Amino acid sequence: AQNPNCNIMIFHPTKEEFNDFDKYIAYMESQGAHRAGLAKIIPPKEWKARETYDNISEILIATPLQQVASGRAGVFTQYHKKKKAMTVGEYRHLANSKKYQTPPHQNFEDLERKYWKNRIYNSPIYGADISGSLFDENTKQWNLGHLGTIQDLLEKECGVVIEGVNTPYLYFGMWKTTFAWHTEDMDLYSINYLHLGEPKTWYVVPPEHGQRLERLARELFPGSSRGCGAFLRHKVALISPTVLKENGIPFNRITQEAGEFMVTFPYGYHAGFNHGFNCAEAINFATPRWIDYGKMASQCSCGEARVTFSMDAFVRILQPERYDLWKRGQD
Ligand SMILES: Cc1ccccc1S(N)(=O)=O
Ligand SMILES: Cc1ccccc1S(N)(=O)=O
Ligand SMILES: Cc1ccccc1S(N)(=O)=O
């Protein structure tokens, strides 16, 4: 078996290899990339997402989210407090202010140390889940707004036509902005392009070991666990690499820089943080191998987890028994 230690693999496709998205994902998996839960793809030197990022300051962040932590330095939850709208230009200025700017540091490792030591004592503001794209319409390869849809994949594989659409989302981050431990909706893949700015550090648990992380989370967040059988779907829980090591949870880490893609694989739990002002674009996607994961995906039915409209059809077709209880939850 390829990649038995479940290491994060890094790929450097040629421009010829970059022409067929589906084929390249399949190639990565033939090399065992999915076993890690996460892969990095560095695009060919000839490729570009767009010409420049010069005129993005007028994008609106309608609902910036202040990420307020509770708990201990290595085991905490965060909740999102809504703030007044601001443009990307205003947000960038805020990110760079004395209150919010990245502190002096020696290297990525030093910054990582500072993040886990001090994250809980600050409340950075994140511009997350903004529908839109920064890919030039003329960028034909790996354009996250031009991927085959999950609905079309499910139709190709299962012969059923369903309603729904899926489109990309933009994320504007600053120092300490955090993504909590989670897998994707329906345990889909995700792909994430860092368009500009400072890096993003990722942590990931191999899909074959996801239940180990779930068991630890139930122990560390006992009230949350009693409230919901799939509370990680709420996307609020953080556990540090030190705490993971102390509890024998297998995981890896890698830092993504501007101009690089990351792919998360079905049922690959991931979490992370931004180093400073940045902008990423991400979208979910599927392949034939996803279908079996979609059929088995846990669901939140306590009401907390947000459902896109399109998730309805996925649950209805792949999980008809659960459909009753789940739909009562989102209503
Ligand atoms: C950038 C480039 C240039 C020539 C052929 C193909 C490409 S690609 N696949 O878009 O990266
Ligand atoms: C609020 C909090 C804080 C730290 C650990 C666990 C929790 S929770 N959501 O009560 O399980
Ligand atoms: C538990 C821990 C904590 C920090 C560094 C290393 C470890 S260990 N003994 O390698 O799992």
Ligand SMILES: Cc1ccccc1S(N)(=O)=O
């Ligand atoms: C023990 C160790 C050390 C470094 C990175 C990851 C691990 S773990 N918890 O074995 O995956």
Ligand SMILES: O=C(O)CNC(=O)C(=O)O
């Ligand atoms: O970038 C972020 O804040 C979170 N991104 C993801 O979880 C993803 O791309 O799957």
Ligand code: NI
């Ligand atoms: Ni994700």
Ligand SMILES: [Zn+2]
């Ligand atoms: Zn729930």
